[PDB]
């Protein structure tokens, strides 16, 4: 493809990305660093602070599904679940904005979303994290890494893998325009189990890769092998996903009242 077409694709994905995701990396980093005047995040470093962060919503508009009633781990478990469910909806909409996507066999569209969603959630989750914690609730809160690592039984090691990944991923200094393409590249993966027509998906992904290649050369001229270092993270993502799945399975076995939202059950049923 001619550079102009690749540059158009990149701008098109950037625009739809801004439309699909409320809290961009640019904004997230701005909050995390302390440079956007407009109330700052409530820091949750322990059980008492987590309560004054959620009960702070009690005075607000009762929207946070479920409230206390059962230990501090279930509270975090429902907050992540809620955000996740929202993310899948935002990602789904963004996927429909990728040229050629809605033109694919419906079944393949569902499969690409099934397998691509968590990989994307963790890629984006990194934008909201730094070494000491992660932003939550549209950035109104900041939950510390230590605190999350201190949760009980298996709850305490769910996020740690995601921070380790985040730290390594954030070191690539990607910005929202770079990410918009990278995410589209993840979605259009022609190696998902159960795909019916592989060629169309791979052809689109090839255009997206050329567009991402040009974007990185133009946006990051001094960073060597950035394209290669970025694609490598796609294999890292497979491991974060499977390891997270295995951890959700431990919860399932070790607690009778697991209760996972239907959409997430739908996605995890017969995944990888």
């Amino acid at each position: 493809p001619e550079s102009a077409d690749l540059r158009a694709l990149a701008k098109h994905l950037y625009d739809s990305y801004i439309k699909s995701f409320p809290l961009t990396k640019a904004k997230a980093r701005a909050i995390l660093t302390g440079k956007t005047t407009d109330k700052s995040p409530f820091v949750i470093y322990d059980m008492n602070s987590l309560m004054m962060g959620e009960d702070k919503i009690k005075f607000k508009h009762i929207t946070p599904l479920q409230e206390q009633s059962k230990e501090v781990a279930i509270r975090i478990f429902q907050g992540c679940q809620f955000r996740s469910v929202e993310a899948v909806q935002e990602i789904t909409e963004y996927a429909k904005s990728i040229p050629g996507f809605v033109n694919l066999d419906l079944n393949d569209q569902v499969t690409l979303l099934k397998y691509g969603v968590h990989e994307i959630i963790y890629t984006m989750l990194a934008s909201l994290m730094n070494k000491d914690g992660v932003l939550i609730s549209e950035g109104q809160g900041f939950m510390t890494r230590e605190f999350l690592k201190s949760l009980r039984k298996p709850f305490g090691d769910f996020m740690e893998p995601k921070f380790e990944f985040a730290v390594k991923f954030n070191a690539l200094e990607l910005d929202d325009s770079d990410l918009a393409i990278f995410i589209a590249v993840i979605i259009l993966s022609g190696d998902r189990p159960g795909l019916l027509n592989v060629k169309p998906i791979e052809d689109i992904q090839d255009n997206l890769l050329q567009a991402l290649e040009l974007q990185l050369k133009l946006n990051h001229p001094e960073s060597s092998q950035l394209f290669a270092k970025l694609l490598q993270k796609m294999t890292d993502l497979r491991q974060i996903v499977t390891e997270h799945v295995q951890l959700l399975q431990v919860i399932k076995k070790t607690e009778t009242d697991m209760s996972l939202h239907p959409l997430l059950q739908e996605i995890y049923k017969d995944l990888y």
Binding site: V88, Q89, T92, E93, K96, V102, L106, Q109, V110, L113, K114, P262, L263, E266, I267, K269, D270
Partner: peptide, 16 residues
């Protein structure tokens, strides 16, 4: 498999 909601999300989207 079915994937009911994923289908719905692709079909229409989500309410307000």
């Amino acid at each position: 498999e079915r994937h009911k909601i994923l289908h719905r999300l692709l079909q229409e989207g989500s309410p307000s």
